[PDB]
Amino acid sequence: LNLDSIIGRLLEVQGSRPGKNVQLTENEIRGLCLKSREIFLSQPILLELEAPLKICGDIHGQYYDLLRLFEYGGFPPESNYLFLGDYVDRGKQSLETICLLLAYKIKYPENFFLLRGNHECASINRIYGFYDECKRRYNIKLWKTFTDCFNCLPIAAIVDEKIFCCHGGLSPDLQSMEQIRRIMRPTDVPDQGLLCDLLWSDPDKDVQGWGENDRGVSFTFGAEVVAKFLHKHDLDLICRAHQVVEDGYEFFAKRQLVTLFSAPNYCGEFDNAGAMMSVDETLMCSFQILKPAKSSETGNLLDKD
Amino acid sequence: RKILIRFSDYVEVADAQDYDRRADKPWTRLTAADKAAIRKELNEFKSTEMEVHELSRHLTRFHRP
Ligand SMILES: [Mn+2]
Ligand SMILES: [Mn+2]
């Protein structure tokens, strides 16, 4: 794998007009998938990470915004990164986005981390754009290779024994962290259960306990659920993604949970900023935002009726 | 309970890229027949091709055609 060449070509379009594609070969992309998959399988499914770290939410194929985010935050390995999923679908350049993230995982495997979002599964990214982008530029077999890689992504991370990180949220089936550690890969994301909820659930200030989720998948959870969870596990913060928020970050339950969203002006239909949360070695958390100067929620389209 | 985390009181802001982020929405161009065929395609792919650990086969998400 000609990793350094791949990274240089991905970064070269920084100075170019937005939307310029990067001309990787099929075999280069396959190599990124296969080598990153091996590394994901060699590391825990529940990552145990240490600050300092920058944590980022959804990107959705907004490759030029990913480049801007790295320029703003520091290109790897100048800063360590944890991404919370939703790399592909519902943007114009899922391929460049995921290829750069996989390349950095391979290049800096102990300093760069990617969790699985609900779009990193076959049934969702078949329909929300990634399959079609793969077919236009390469072929369906390449999409199948990506699926094998995504099926091996880790599902959650804990930073310094105090920040619990996942794409979606809590689950009524999450009583012990060992239940996450026991999940074996490769795996799909199911339509219900613990692994679904970690990738799909949302907080809701008006739910007492667990509620239905209008995505048609998983649950909503209230502030008291968050407080009880943090207390039981001696954690200080849930850090998740999965919802567009106006400032790119948004607190829930008296700052016991934060939502991060890293794709500014999402899909050209929202006027939101994209943010990342920087955690220093003292566990002081700060936000860096890139601000422009339910329609957005993915649901149960393929299966409802 | 002692809390270790703290939050800065100052957020850093910079300008996002100025460009057209609108993207195609292929999922708006699916007939009922297209959706049935995609459900079948996914089922066949996950039944015959997609590798899944033995202890996770119960998590594979099949669709009702
Ligand atoms: Mn998303
Ligand atoms: Mn999501």
Numbering used by the authors:
A (entry chain A): 7 to 299, 326 to 337
B (entry chain C): 516 to 580
What text does the study give?
The four Phosphatase and actin regulator (Phactr) proteins are novel PIPs that are implicated in cytoskeletal regulation in animal models and cell culture settings. Here, we show that Phactr1 confers sequence-specificity on the Phactr1/PP1 holoenzyme. We show that efficient catalysis requires interactions between conserved hydrophobic residues in the substrate and a novel Phactr1-PP1 composite surface, which comprises a hydrophobic pocket and associated amphipathic cavity with a surrounding basic rim.
That this might be the case was suggested by our structural analysis of a phosphomimetic fusion construct, in which the S455 is substituted by glutamate, at 1.39 Å resolution (Phactr1/PP1-IRSp53(S455E)). Instead, IRSp53 T456 occupies the position corresponding to S455 in the wildtype complex, with a recruited phosphate positioned as in the wild-type complex, and the glutamate (S455E) in effect occupies position −1, pointing away from the catalytic site. Nevertheless, the critical contacts between IRSp53(S455E) L459/L460 and the Phactr1/PP1 hydrophobic pocket are maintained, extending the intervening sequence G457-N458-L459. Consistent with this, both wildtype IRSp53 pT456 and IRSp53 E455/pT456 were effective substrates for Phactr1/PP1, exhibiting three- to fivefold higher KM, but only twofold lower catalytic efficiency, while IRSp53 pS453 and pS454 were very poor substrates, exhibiting 10–30 fold lower catalytic efficiency. Thus, Phactr1/PP1 substrates can tolerate either three or four residues between the target residue and the hydrophobic residue that engages the Phactr1/PP1 hydrophobic pocket (see Discussion). For example, IRSp53 pT456, with only four residues to the pocket-bound L460, has comparable kinetic properties to the bona fide IRSp53 pS455.
